[PDB]
Every structure is written in structure tokens, then in C-alpha cells.
Design a protein around this ligand. Sequence first.
Ligand code: K04
Lengths: 412, 412
Amino acid sequence: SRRRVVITGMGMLSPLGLDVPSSWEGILAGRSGIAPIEHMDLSAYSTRFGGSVKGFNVEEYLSAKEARKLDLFIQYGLAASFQAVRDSGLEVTDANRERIGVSMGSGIGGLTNIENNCRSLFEQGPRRISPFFVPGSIINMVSGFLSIHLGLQGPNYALTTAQTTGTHSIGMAARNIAYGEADVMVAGGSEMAACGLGLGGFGAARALSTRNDEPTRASRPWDRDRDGFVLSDGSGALVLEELEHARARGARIYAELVGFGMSGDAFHMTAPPEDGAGAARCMKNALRDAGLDPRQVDYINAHGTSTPAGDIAEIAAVKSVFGEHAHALSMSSTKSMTGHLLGAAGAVEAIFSVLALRDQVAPPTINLDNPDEGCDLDLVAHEAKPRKIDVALSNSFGFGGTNGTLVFRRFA
Amino acid sequence: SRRRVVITGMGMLSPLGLDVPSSWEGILAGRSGIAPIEHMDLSAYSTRFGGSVKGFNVEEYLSAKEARKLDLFIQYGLAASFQAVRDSGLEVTDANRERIGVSMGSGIGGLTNIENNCRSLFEQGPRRISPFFVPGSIINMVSGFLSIHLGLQGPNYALTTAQTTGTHSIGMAARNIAYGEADVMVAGGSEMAACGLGLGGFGAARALSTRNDEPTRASRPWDRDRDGFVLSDGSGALVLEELEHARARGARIYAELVGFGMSGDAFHMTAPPEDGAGAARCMKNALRDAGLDPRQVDYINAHGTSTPAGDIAEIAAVKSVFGEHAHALSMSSTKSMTGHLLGAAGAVEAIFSVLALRDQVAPPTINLDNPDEGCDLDLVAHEAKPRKIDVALSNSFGFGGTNGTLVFRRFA
Ligand SMILES: C[C@H]1CCO[C@@H]1C(=O)Nc1cnns1
């Protein structure tokens, strides 16, 4: 048998806010976090906008000295992680520290740090590379530094599954608890790839919206005028906890994590198949994992990146999985507002899925002015929709055809 | 309920050979794969040698047209995975493709590729970044590309836990099979961090041996004259298989994976604790997971990186875990010959640990001329030691204080 896993703590940096409640306020108001990128000459780039974290103050979390050693993606990961642990009320002791672990991931990791040390290397040679280059850039250092700061001796690892990282991180952390490898996990992801290499690299593949005249309208999932995703920065962290452990200490429980699904498309390196067969197997895997019938699903936080082939694939996959219930559930893309946080996308979207359960509201898909051919589901166009939500899904479909689905249910 | 997991296939690129048997012959004969690096000018660097993969032909596996788009770490990952799958005898069909997944990891991933595209961005501009920069560089694309070429639709993911990556990838893939998430997994890791940023960054931290005048003698685990690790490239892949699934198809079984441990040190970003307390916790978890008396352990493939603090920490951990039996078992570091493959270290060493079981021989620790203070165990100095091996343990320890132990035993 399996132990039940609940959410007792959440943390976030997003383009909408420096914590969960500010971010969630933005989401329910349909506000965009997308804007031209500042303090960076993007003259030579086809995309000049994205979702930046605005007014982040790392000294709320770290000494200036410890922050100087760590890539922005690590700083953002630690910020969400510290918020989430604080939010949980959890007290680490010698009696429980071996039962508390971390799985914070990233899709792309330390590009900004890699960029600046490349500058040093090419200009002045290798003796100007920072001593903290490696440990300050590698993806497992959010898990590493958090475990050191809080004395966490439980399973300590990091996933990197591109745009699926946060969803897989939360899911596999839930498995650790369910099968008794840990009582508590801090799970999620962080990302900061709005450097030249990120904007340039995605730009070279012509994957990015180039709607530079109206950045806030760039991200328009399922709209006929969409022209690729918007690159965004930030982090999500959840405190995952065994139910009896949560009840014994009187924790506030936001919701229950009931289901986790994984699948591989085995199709293309960057493009999903048109019928979304892989996303369909992954959602079916997640519902079977949760012992739920597709009919019980009320809300889906779509991957919904605003790529032509991705958006249409997800519709095909929802209609395939849900049949005559596909129109009854509400499905929205909060990427319409946040843009695509890549490896942190699944983390902040799991948090939005949990908050949809708490507040009984489907977040909007903003900019959905002209649904495309066969995009005829309840996509929650323009404005938030209060409704009954007992069961919420969060999907992530990333490069390499790697898919994740989380299933959350109301707890009472 | 928890299923048993066996090894039915292995594959490798190492500094000692372009497959497993050629690499293993090198291990048993005490041959070094460490040499001055030829693929770049290192005159400005304080370390000018490492374990290069010699004479690698990507056209044994992939079209030149596809290989051109991929970092060497992905090429090396695919080579090893392809070897392991062929070696397994497994045939992928519509009946089983949903039950076969892949977990191939990396510590750093496509650093060469990111550096070269960084040079294009800085010298010319963003218009010269390869359209293949992202899918050709990010860590999850070994798993991605492998699933696309073989049609693997099972769990598809990648770990990045620095020098522990290979051990964690193999352990967590076993858990997937153990718990019914898959019946087959291709798991391990790949690394190619020998670019300017890699040799420069580890150099900046003064973590590397600078024995440039005698590179084959640089890697000297537990030797009093050791001065840091030797940086090495390559890949290890194993096919992990549910036992009854293996029995049902008449698979050749190399050995059984009976134990997996993880722990965090929660000590330091980069230094291990002198007492090996996190390594001891990790091995004890692994031995309890295997249902073993620690006196059943015959052979340990140590992390044994040839750092002053790392090597002594391991002795202390082994003495704390095994007490008087610490004097009866054999422990060696194959990093004495291969150098440190970082994220691939745990993958190649898991394979050496299985071959130690097949051939009943402890590989040597070469260059152990003057064992250091307290390094008084059977460290198999100089020469391979034929001996009874029923149970073999493989340890990895990484930046972030992240620990992994694998336990293998002979299968009857
Ligand atoms: C000893 C190894 C390497 C050369 O031949 C063997 C092999 O498996 N080759 C493969 C090619 N494609 N898939 S496997």
C-alpha cells in the first residue's frame, strides 16, 4: 500500500509577484507580467520582451556574500523554498531531519553565470573564472544549499526535464513520501534564462513570440494569432508532507496530491505529435494512479505555451482522455499571464492548481480573442470563472517528448 | 508490492575503451586512461590533462547529420544506452513500449556547446546562435533522443546531482521498476566537461590535480601525495529489468540490484565532512534497503576521487558502517585509472561493480604507493585481487552534500 501526501506550504517568485498571494491576485485579475526586458541591449534579438521577476531582494534570504556565489536561478529557487518551508510552519529537529529531503530542479540552469564567466574566459583567459563557478551554476545546488541551510538529511536530488522539470520534481517527491523514503519534501523548480543565450537560443529555433509591439498580448494560448511562447523567470516550491505527519503537528493542508503521471511521446525533439497521444497516456496514467475516473476532473491547468502545434495537441489529448466530459471541465493556461517559466512552469502551475481548489475559481486564459480551429472547449477566455472544483490536473509537456501530470483533490 | 530488479544489459565509453569489455580489460590490467588533452590549447590552464574518450566514432550509432546537432555528452549517452539495449537482447514492441523508460543524467551537460554558442554570441551576435543550441545542450535530451530512436514511451527523465548523478539515476530507475511504474529502464549518465569553462572552473576552485608532468600518476586515491581529482569524460548505461519480466524472456542476468541509499550531508556546498557522517547514513540506508548484514559486503567501489578530504571521509564512513568487517572486505577506486567522470562516474562504476561480481575480482587502486594516515584497509593497491564477491557496493558523493549507494549481489 501507499501513504497519502498533502500540500502544507507553498512559495513562489513569478513575473506577477514576489510571493504566492501577490502572484495569485495577478492571475485572478488577468494581469500580464510580460514587458520589454531591461538593463540588457536586445537590439540584435528578434524577441525583446519576457516575464522578469521585478524587485527581487535576495538579502531577505541570503547575506550579500552567499548571494554573490549563486546564479539567479539558484537564488530564485532558494527564495521559493524558504517561503514554502516558512508557510508550512514545519520545525526541523534531530528527531525528523533524516525524514526531510529536497527535489528542486531547473530546465536550463546557470546560463547567466555561464555567460559572465565566458566573458572573463574569452577576454582575460581562465584565471579570471570565479572559484564558485561550478557549485554556483549546477542545477542540484538549490537542493544542496537548502539542505545545508535547514539541516535537511533526507533524499537530496534535482530533476532536469526541460519544461516538465517542476511537475516531475513535485511528482517524484510525492513518490518518496508515499513509499516511506521521506515524511516531508520541498519540491519544485526555478529558472532564469532571460539572458542572451536563452532569448538567443530559443530565438534561433524561432520558438518565441516576436510580438515586440505588444508584449502583454504575445502569450495567447489557443488564439489563431499566437506565434510561439514567451520566456519567463521565477520559481515554485511546495512543502509535500505525509498526511498523518501533517495532522499530528496541526498543519494547515491546502490540498491532497492524489495522482502523478509520466509518459514519453517518443516522437520529436521539440514538437509534440498532432493528436497529443503522449499527453493523453500521461493524463490517463495520472488518473489511474489517483484511482479516479476522467469524469471526476473539474479543472486542468494546461501546459498551454502559445505554440501553434503544442496548444492544438493538448486539445486533441483532452478530448481523447475525457470524451463526453471534455466540455464540462474548465481548462486554462496561466502562461497567458506569466509566460513560460520552463523548468519552474510546473511548480508555479501546481501552486495555481492548488489555489484553484482553495478558492473554487478557474484562472483565465487571457488574450483568447479568436479561438483556433477545434479549440471549442471551456478555455476560460478573458476572465476568472468561479465554479465547483473537487479535482484539478496540472500538465507539463517538454522537449524530448517528456510529459508529466499532477492530480490534486480538495482535502477535508 | 515491491518487485525485484536485475541488470540484463550494460554499455560504456570511458578513457579506457569504446565499450564495456575493452574498458574492463583496462581496469583489471591497472592501465591509466589519463593523458595530456589534445582537443584544445591548455597552455594558460593549471591542469592540461584528463581522461578523454579516445577514437570515439559517433557514426557507429548515428548519422553525421544528427550527431552534428548534439553535444558530445549526448553523443556519449546515446552510444552507451544503444550498447546497453543491444547487449540486453530486449526487443521494443507495441505490447511493451509503454513499460520501458529512460533516466540518463549529467552533472553539467552541454558545456562545450554552450561555450561555443557563447563565443558566437559575444564575437558576432545572437543571429549566429545554432537553432539546435537548446535541444542539443540541455541534460534531459539523452533520455529524449533515446526514447525517439528506440520508441520508449515509459517514464522519461534525467537527474542532475553533480558527481552522484549516475548512482542516483540507476537507483531511482530501479525504484520505478520496483514500484510498478515501468518493467524496463535504461539508466546511468554521461559527461564531457573538458572545455575551457570546465577545466577553468574546476581549476579556479583548485579542485584538480596539477601533476601535468606525470598525468597517469595524478589520480592516487588515499595516497599521501594526492592533490585533487582528474577530470574525465564518458558514459555508462545499464538496462534495469523487473525479475519475472527478465525470466519470462530468458534474459541473461548479470546481477541483482538489491539496495539503494540516498542522504544529504547538510554540511558544505563542496567539502565532505571529515567523519564521513552522510556517507555512513547513505550506506546504512542502502544495506537496510537490501535486507543485509553489513558483514555480507565483500567489495566496495569507492567514490575515491583523490582529494585530501574526500578520500579520508570515505575511510571513516566505511569504518563506522562496517566496524571490524571493514578490515575483511576489499575497497578500491577505479578513478585511480579512469579519473573522475563526474555525473557518469556512478554509471561506469556501477558497471565495474557488476563485472567484479561476474568475474569474482576486485579491481586495483593504482598509484597507491604510500597510503595516507588511517587508510589501513584492503584498498587493493597496484594489482587486481581475485576473491569471493557475493555483495558489491558502489558509492558516490557530490557537491550539495548529496550521497548515493547502490548494492548489487550475484543472481542464482
Ligand atoms: C561494442 C559496441 C560498440 C561497437 O559495437 C557495439 C555496439 O553495441 N554497437 C552499436 C551500434 N548501435 N547500437 S549498439
